[PDB]
Ligand binder design. Structure first.
Ligand SMILES: [Cl-]
Ligand SMILES: [Cl-]
Ligand SMILES: [Cl-]
Ligand SMILES: [Cl-]
Ligand SMILES: [Cl-]
Ligand SMILES: [Cl-]
Ligand SMILES: [Cl-]
Ligand SMILES: [Cl-]
Ligand code: NA
Ligand code: NA
Ligand code: NA
Ligand code: NA
Length: 129
């Protein structure tokens, strides 16, 4: 599923990501934009053999099981495939664990490089939320 901008903002708010660990909704929308262009089916192979999945490009080294990442963990206790669903529940629940891990949203390198410090509210501007 490719979400619209306000459509994803609303879904993220419904699942309790708005101001989760102090990160406003615009932060999450921005991160999704640059991770996946709002596409739940986005996948990206890493040089290390891990793969990133879904709207927030969650990695198989730590967070989900894909059966092909040697030595990895599955801290969110999910098959990585659940991260590709039109239902963002599994993506959101897993992102809450990731953002709680110590480094906040810096866990998403694209958030640090493209969203951090910017006018992230622009991402929810205009939306009925
Ligand atoms: Cl957009
Ligand atoms: Cl915001
Ligand atoms: Cl497996
Ligand atoms: Cl594995
Ligand atoms: Cl594990
Ligand atoms: Cl599994
Ligand atoms: Cl959803
Ligand atoms: Cl933080
Ligand atoms: Na994701
Ligand atoms: Na894994
Ligand atoms: Na999901
Ligand atoms: Na950018």
């Amino acid at each position: 599923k490719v979400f619209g901008r306000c459509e994803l903002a609303a879904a993220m708010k419904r699942h309790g990501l708005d101001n989760y660990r102090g990160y406003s909704l615009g932060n999450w929308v921005c991160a999704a934009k640059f991770e996946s262009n709002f596409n739940t089916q986005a996948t990206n192979r890493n040089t290390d053999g891990s793969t990133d999945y879904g709207i927030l490009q969650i990695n198989s080294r730590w967070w989900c099981n894909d059966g092909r990442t040697p030595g990895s963990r599955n801290l969110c206790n999910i098959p990585c495939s659940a991260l590709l669903s039109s239902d963002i529940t599994a993506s959101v629940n897993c992102a809450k664990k990731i953002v709680s891990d110590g480094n906040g949203m810096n866990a998403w390198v694209a958030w640090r490089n493209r969203c951090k410090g910017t006018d992230v509210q622009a991402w929810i501007r205009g939306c009925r939320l």
